[PDB]
Ligand SMILES: CC(C)=CCC/C(C)=C/CC/C(C)=C/CC/C(C)=C/CC/C(C)=C/CC/C(C)=C/CC/C(C)=C/CC/C(C)=C/CC/C(C)=C/CC1=C(C)C(=O)c2ccccc2C1=O
Ligand SMILES: CC(C)=CCC/C(C)=C\CC/C(C)=C/CC/C(C)=C/CC/C(C)=C/CC/C(C)=C/CC/C(C)=C/CC/C(C)=C/CC/C(C)=C\CC1=C(C)C(=O)c2ccccc2C1=O
Ligand SMILES: CCCCCCCCCCCCCCCC(=O)O[C@H](COC(=O)CCCCCCC[C@@H](C)CCCCCCCCC)COP(=O)(O)O[C@H]1[C@H](O)[C@H](O)[C@H](O)[C@@H](O)[C@@H]1O
Ligand SMILES: CCCCCCCCCCCCCCCC(=O)O[C@H](COC(=O)CCCCCCC[C@@H](C)CCCCCCCCC)COP(=O)(O)O[C@H]1[C@H](O)[C@H](O)[C@H](O)[C@@H](O)[C@@H]1O
Ligand SMILES: CCCCCCCCCCCCCCCC(=O)O[C@H](COC(=O)CCCCCCC[C@@H](C)CCCCCCCCC)COP(=O)(O)O[C@H]1[C@H](O)[C@H](O)[C@H](O)[C@@H](O)[C@@H]1O
């Protein structure tokens with residue numbers, strides 16, 4: 018749309034031309050060129066907030082978004098027009114699809130997640146560490162569109178999962194599994210984070226062992 | 241997935257890397273390659289009967305030794321190397337030990353309820369191609385795993 | 401074949417026979433109908449750990 | 454120590470060639486059957502296709518002929534949506550399999566797609582009535598498609614596997630075979646009998662399509 | 670104690686009736702379907718058979734044609750080893766599906782297996798050139814078998830389910846369709862054009878076989 | 886077990902209540918599971934028409950409804966209703982009118 022393109026350009030010119038140079042070409046050693054990144058990349062990155070980025074470090078951290086959905090769409094449309102590339106999914110009305118991205122199959126989504134996603138994130142989408150200051154973040158904050166677009170465009174040190182590699186049905190199943198694992202209550206008590214051995218051992222040593230030692234000190238006599 | 245990855249790391253790699261007999265120990269434990277169809281039955285035997293039987297026998301020896309080699313005590317007013325100052329078994333020690341057992345099992349039950357331990361349903365079935373990022377053993381084997389991680393990748397290659 | 405038919409006769413039949421709690425005992429022991437998929441693991445535990453202990 | 458073999462910067466390499474997998478030997482000798490048939494010849498099997506093209510090099514029809522249980526279970530589908538006009542194209546089986554644009558086996562005019570060495574390619578021992586060489590009219594309507602079959606088995610896979618490759622040639626005539634009997638109709642010379650050229654095979658104008666049935 | 674229910678001397682019983690199982694409502698959500706086709710009509714599917722009988726009730730042949738992917742694949746198997754003599758036969762699609770021994774839709778002589786309501790059963794909107802009302806020919810050798818296909822798709826599965834059941838009628842002629850062009854040949858009255866009856870459909874002597882295509 | 890009663894011996898057959906029409910001509914289908922503790926009763930003896938169980942040596946008279954005429958068993962073997970469907974294949978003409986395995990408390994009602 019003409020006005021959408023104009024709004025995207027105006028936001029771009031006063032947000033990122035210092036590190037994604039005007040004309041969408043990347044500033045050498047400050048930011049990559051956005052030609053070909055597409056609307057999905059812009060949506061995911063700006064909505065998660067990573068892109069109003071105020072440091073060059075191991076990894077761009079997530080943060081509150083600096084733009085509302087309309088401005089996100091404007092920036093995405095501008096980048097898509099300039100470069101041309103993957104587009105964020107949308108529902109019948111036109112808004113970014115959230116529920117439509119919940120795949121029907123969850124066992125298949127979990128299998129795909131374990132084969133591809135858990136590699137670094139977790140068994141259930143908690144975070145993971147990477148080589149030098151990087152890390153795979155927890156997926157519990159991401160909404161279905163954000164998960165789908167994260168797969169569609171490998172944000173940073175994350176493999177780029179094309180539609181051919183993971184058909185949109187497979188990505189929808191993975192999104193369903195991610196949301197289900199994130200929103201599912203821990204059966205058996207308080208899941209201490211999602212990592213078994215380390216949080217479980219700390220909770221033993223702090224809750225059970227201090228209780229046992231304190232009870233022993235109560236029963237016995239100091240000497 | 242988690243525990244099978246831990247097995248693949250420790251039991252398989254460490255066993256199979258041992259120079260003179262490493263592969264021979266690996267194949268004899270696993271009945272062949274790593275995913276051999278007898279590993280878990282063998283571990284089940286070892287874990288429900290063999291090792292717990294030895295632990296029970298050694299705990300019996302331990303408690304018998306403590307019982308008949310009278311428990312040592314800290315220096316104190318009436319405490320010498322040739323006496324035991326404390327309380328007799330029947331009235332006080334027995335009751336307080338039983339109460340301590342009750343309280344310890346209460347703590348264990350409370351934690352079994354309120355705290356989630358090893359959500360295997362979250363941890364999918366073992367597949368060699370799948371893995372997570374945590375990949376840790378219980379806190380008692382965590383020091384062995386940490387030794388594996390920290391040791392600086394020193395490998396030696398003798399003649400062939 | 402021999403041990404399985406012996407089990408079917410003795411355990412299953414005589415357990416179901418018991419008047420007030422026979423079928424309940426059968427279902428508790430086999431976790432279901434006779435060929436329940438937990439019978440031999442349960443017997444293995446009982447035989448290598450519990451009864452020998 | 455470090456691994457003995459590493460770090461070969463030189464010899465940049467070459468792009469791997471397209472893999473041409475060898476067939477599974479006696480070890481994995483199992484393979485899919487190519488089709489069971491009587492095969493009273495060197496061997497053709499139960500699978501044989503062909504493309505009947507036009508004088509412009511474009512495919513018109515796509516025929517398929519192959520024995521299934523002793524009889525040819527064939528099927529033909531139009532390869533283009535406007536190959537045949539709104540009418541009946543007369544199919545026939547020509548002994549010569551060369552689906553050339555225009556050829557003349559004998560000394561005479563070379564009709565378009567007239568590579569046939571005669572009329573209808575009958576059996577070796579049959580040269581009278583319209584044997585398996587002959588075929589009837591297959592109709593293409595305004596839609597422009599052809600798919601319909603009959604029972605013409607004067608020959609078999611063995612007969613098809615003859616000395617010369619055969620072809621399916623579709624001209625622009627129907628199937629009548631002297632529908633005007635001698636009782637009422639008369640010929641040019643006044644004889645009430647029919648024409649030998651018309652009786653031997655379906656004669657029409659310029660051939661519309663032609664395709665070699667030698668697994669074309 | 671004896672069990673409460675035993676022994677029945679009276680009521681000898683009856684022979685169990687032949688079992689007639691019912692389609693599964695529980696296991697199948699709906700009704701299982703066979704052949705798949707567009708079926709632009711009340712519904713015929715991708716499965717349609719027919720048996721062409723003789724004047725004395727003998728099975729002349731067994732045809733079967735059905736739509737698969739918009740093109741109708743067909744095949745005919747000889748019903749007897751000597752149904753057709755050592756010659757040629759012309760197969761035509763007749764609008765009337767009654768494969769009677771002899772009938773006459775119009776006011777005139779009732780030819781054998783002439784139940785057709787006219788010549789070739791062309792399409793509803795097509796009545797000129799030889800539309801799908803004409804089928805492929807059937808050439809029989811000394812073996813006496815029928816198996817061959819053409820590309821006749823002026824009508825489809827949708828057009829097959831017309832107002833009246835159609836049939837395939839095979840007479841004992843070849844496929845010519847006025848192969849004698851007006852340039853050389855002449856008619857009985859001297860005109861060089863062909864005969865309307867001959868052009869409408871394959872005309873020959875008494876019909877040899879006739880089979881209704883209404884899933885006969 | 887589907888047993889073919891000889892035509893000559895078909896006149897000695899005595900049928901149970903509600904099982905008179907179960908047999909398809911001379912074909913009788915009786916559960917193999919012994920009515921006493923449920924072992925298969927596979928040992929079929931022809932010319933005596935006795936279905937013997939090997940586990941505890943109980944004979945059931947196949948000619949009559951398969952009632953036990955020896956051994957620990959006290960209940961007859963359940964008789965399957967059989968017939969022929971289209972194409973002549975043997976099919977069950979219903980289900981057992983009684984529970985078929987060995988007996989238990991909640992039975993015979
Ligand atoms: C190989 C190795 C140990 C490398 C170094 C890594 C390491 C342990 C670094 C230190 C971690 C810390 C303390 C980070 C904060 C930044 C930092 C270093 C600050 C300066 C430290 C300093 C001198 C501070 C002043 C006084 C002081 C010593 C304060 C220490 C503060 C802390 C964190 C004290 C408690 C120790 C602690 C929790 C350490 C992390 C270790 C583990 C294994 C935690 C386990 C655990 C985790 C990881 C969960 O996610 C979780 C989720 C839900 C429920 C339960 C848990 C749980 O129990
Ligand atoms: C859903 C589900 C299945 C839930 C259940 C979970 C499950 C599977 C299992 C747990 C369930 C159970 C059964 C829990 C309770 C376990 C249990 C037996 C607790 C007993 C504690 C209790 C009820 C105390 C009541 C308070 C009271 C009046 C206490 C005084 C009387 C009693 C009970 C005295 C007991 C004395 C006692 C602990 C004897 C242990 C016997 C053994 C093995 C060793 C004895 C012994 C001891 C204890 C030493 O300390 C010692 C130290 C140095 C040298 C030698 C010894 C020695 O020989
Ligand atoms: C003493 C015995 C008592 C033991 C404690 C028992 C507590 C019982 C709690 C009530 C029953 C169980 C509730 C289970 C529901 C439940 O799981 O609880 C979560 C909370 O979780 C948190 O944040 C933690 C909140 C802080 C409170 C609990 C802290 C207790 C620790 C301290 C106990 C261990 C001791 C360790 C000592 C440490 C010091 C060492 C020196 C809440 O949901 P949420 O917050 O959204 O979880 C996110 C998913 O959503 C999202 O996708 C996912 O991606 C995640 O982000 C996930 O967090
Ligand atoms: C529960 C199981 C308990 C074990 C019981 C069973 C154990 C049986 C072991 C003996 C069986 C025979 C050994 C077979 C395998 C073998 O061991 O290799 C030999 C090795 O001899 C040498 O030359 C080595 C000496 C020369 C280098 C000097 C090195 C000094 C080192 C050892 C110092 C470091 C020690 C530190 C200890 C650290 C301990 C850690 C806690 C040479 O190969 P070869 O015998 O021909 O076997 C061929 C395969 O090598 C071939 O790959 C295959 O293709 C076949 O052809 C096979 O036949
Ligand atoms: C490890 C497991 C340990 C066991 C723990 C669990 C045991 C729980 C047992 C209680 C659960 C409820 C009983 C269910 C089942 C039940 O027992 O049956 C009842 C029976 O009450 C009566 O009238 C009987 C009394 C009248 C006759 C008088 C008989 C005197 C006898 C007993 C004397 C001989 C004793 C000799 C002992 C020899 C010992 C041998 C060593 C009536 O039927 P009903 O409760 O409605 O249940 C319906 C099913 O009958 C129905 O077939 C089904 O369709 C359902 O609808 C079901 O709900």
Ligand code: HEC
Pocket residue numbers: 065067076077078079129130133134135136137138147151152153154155156157158159163164165167168172173174175176178191192195
């Ligand atoms: C280590 C390889 C890697 C794998 C494979 C991978 N991820 Fe990621 N993922 C990352 C990293 C690194 C980030 C952080 C990117 C950034 O912050 O720019 C990330 C970001 C995300 C986010 C954004 C979460 C947020 O709140 O910002 C989600 C959701 C996500 N990944 C899910 C997935 C899904 C779905 C797959 C599909 C298999 C997957 N991951 C596979 C490493 C990976």
Ligand code: FES
Pocket residue numbers: 409919920921922923924925926938939940941942943956957958
């Ligand atoms: S098991 Fe058959 S009679 Fe006892």
